[PDB]
Ligand binder design. Structure first.
Ligand SMILES: Nc1ncnc2c1ncn2[C@@H]1O[C@H](COP(=O)(O)OP(=O)(O)O)[C@@H](O)[C@H]1O
Ligand SMILES: [Zn+2]
Ligand SMILES: [Zn+2]
Length: 541
């Protein structure tokens, strides 16, 4: 067990990064790299705090940290974010002046961003910085690009194996997307890491509700369910990102949203630094409500309170999908992630990959598109399927407290609205709330029959038309009369209802108990649960 940080370390974190404490895995990596000078392979979920692991140590000791990445636009964005935290950083490339390079040699910058190509060609420069200043760490983001079995291989990374040779005292921190053992093996062997610490944060984002819908045929019909008509104009429910597979589909979606006068912006690769800066400005400040994006990184979609992610079209793969939905709910508030898809979507098109020569690669793409289509068509828990892919193992639904609840995914939410089996211990809270309310709404003056007719939307004359205006009228048609009758007998046995006759023995009423009235009081103001021992009559297999 590693030690807690000292006060000087915490003070540095507050002054430069505005955080009052390290996250657990952040400190795992930081202490290992900063104080133990040990190589690291770190797998961090979306929105955990990956960048702090390599930005903080060079700031704390006032030396240089080298960040190797192929995403030039992302390195530009992070440089700006660092300077706005009073941290000097720069992107080093062939196009840079010697004044920037001489300021680097004098130690004016804490964090230096380079591409893999520039790094392979200038190993002598790296050794000079190590002798004169000292390199705290070398970060290799997108480290899965080092070998084939990742979702995106690059050849420029293979020459990073000389870093350990030219700099055997400098620890390397490699960041990758999944906890895949095979990918981690390749990173260690190709980067020449020496017994590195292996850390994984887990991948669950419990505040992200997951849903998958089929496309309806036209864009406006697909998107209008996500809109609210305030006054006499349309609005998104909250800040929204719409991911499109192509620029063409981006323009089509934009053209349709403009029909409703929705405030929208686009986000693509190859945009200028000024364009990305302006999009970030408008999105963060809620001057645009929706960003329609074809990329999943950068300033433009770096926003804390994104409430809704929409994939318009099947996602490319599970890794892209996870990163793309990972942009939502970074403030901890409840967010929703919807995929709108059809079998003809371009990312599910097996027509356009017959012409790839590699044997294992073509089979990988076929299995990925089959895995994607299986997830989209699945009736089981969306969250369990996603967590299984990134843990490289079958995940149990009992591992996290979010699975199986109404805020988990659409397939879990369907089971709470109309239960089914796969001892039966199930949450009948939603159904009990309908029944116990109907008993109290009708005044506890009739038998259980009238509340049942109320819930099933009966046209009977026993029910006064004043009750047909109610919200619950007809919301129980999912269950038969005998089901509601049998469910009421379980509420009598458990002790939430009782049958009672007063002086008039020709009138039997069904009334709430003390426990019944107490439960309904809490359920009026909070979503309450009610666990039961059931029969296959209640939740059939
Ligand atoms: N130690 C910390 N305490 C609290 N919040 C943090 C900490 N480290 C990072 N964060 C926040 O987490 C958010 C996501 O971090 P970031 O590195 O941008 O995620 P990603 O690695 O997915 O891009 C950031 O807005 C950042 O402010
Ligand atoms: Zn230690
Ligand atoms: Zn679920």
């Amino acid at each position: 067990l590693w030690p807690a940080p000292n006060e000087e370390q915490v003070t540095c974190l507050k002054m430069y990064f505005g955080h009052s404490s390290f996250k657990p895995v952040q400190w795992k990596v930081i202490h290992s790299v900063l104080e133990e000078r040990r190589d690291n392979v770190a797998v961090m979920a979306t929105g955990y705090g990956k960048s702090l692991c390599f930005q903080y140590p060079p700031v704390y000791v006032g030396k240089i940290g080298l960040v190797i990445s192929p995403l030039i636009s992302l390195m530009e964005d992070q440089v700006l974010q660092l300077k706005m935290s009073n941290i000097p950083a720069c992107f080093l490339g062939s196009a840079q002046s010697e004044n920037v390079l001489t300021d680097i040699k004098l130690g004016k910058y804490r964090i230096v961003y380079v591409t893999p190509e520039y790094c392979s060609g200038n190993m002598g420069l790296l050794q000079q910085l190590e002798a004169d200043i000292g390199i705290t760490l070398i970060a290799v983001d997108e480290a899965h690009c080092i070998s084939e079995w990742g979702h995106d291989f690059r050849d420029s990374f293979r020459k990073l194996g000389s870093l350990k040779t030219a700099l055997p005292m400098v620890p390397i921190v490699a960041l990758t997307a999944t906890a895949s053992s095979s990918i981690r093996e390749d990173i260690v062997r190709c980067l020449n890491l020496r017994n590195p610490q292996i850390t994984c944060t887990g991948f669950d984002r419990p505040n992200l509700y997951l849903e998958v819908r089929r496309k309806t045929g036209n864009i406006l019909q697909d998107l209008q369910p996500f809109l609210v008509k305030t006054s006499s104009h349309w609005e998104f429910e909250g800040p929204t990102i719409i991911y499109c597979p192509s620029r063409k589909m981006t323009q089509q979606v934009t053209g349709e949203l403009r029909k409703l006068n929705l405030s929208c912006g686009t986000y693509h690769a190859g945009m200028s630094f000024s364009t990305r800066k302006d999009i970030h400005h408008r999105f963060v400040r809620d001057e645009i409500q929706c960003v329609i994006a074809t990329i999943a990184f950068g300033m433009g979609i770096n926003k804390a309170d994104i409430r809704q992610v929409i994939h318009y079209g099947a996602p490319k793969d599970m890794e892209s999908y996870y990163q793309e939905i990972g942009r939502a709910g970074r403030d901890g508030l409840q967010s929703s992630c919807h995929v709108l898809w059809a079998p003809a979507d371009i990312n599910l098109n097996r027509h356009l990959l017959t012409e790839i020569r590699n044997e294992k690669f073509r089979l990988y793409k076929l299995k990925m598109m089959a895995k994607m289509e299986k997830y989209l068509h699945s009736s089981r828990c969306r969250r369990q399927i996603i967590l299984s892919h990134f843990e490289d193992k079958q995940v149990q639904k009992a591992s996290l407290g979010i699975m199986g609840t109404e805020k988990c995914c659409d397939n879990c939410r369907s089971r709470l609205d109309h239960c089914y089996s796969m001892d039966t211990s199930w949450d009948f809270g939603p159904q009990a709330f309908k029944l116990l309310s109907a008993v109290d709404i009708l005044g506890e003056k009739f038998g259980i029959g009238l509340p049942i007719l109320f819930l099933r939307g009966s046209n009977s004359q026993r029910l006064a038309d004043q009750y047909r205006r109610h919200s619950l009228f007809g919301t129980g048609k999912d269950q038969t009369e005998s089901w509601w009758k049998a469910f009421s007998r379980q509420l009598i046995t458990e002790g939430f209802l009782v049958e009672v006759s007063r002086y008039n023995k020709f009138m039997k009423i069904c009334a709430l108990t003390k426990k019944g009235r107490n439960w309904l009081h809490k359920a009026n103001t909070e979503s309450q649960s009610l666990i039961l021992q059931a029969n296959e009559e209640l939740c059939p297999k």
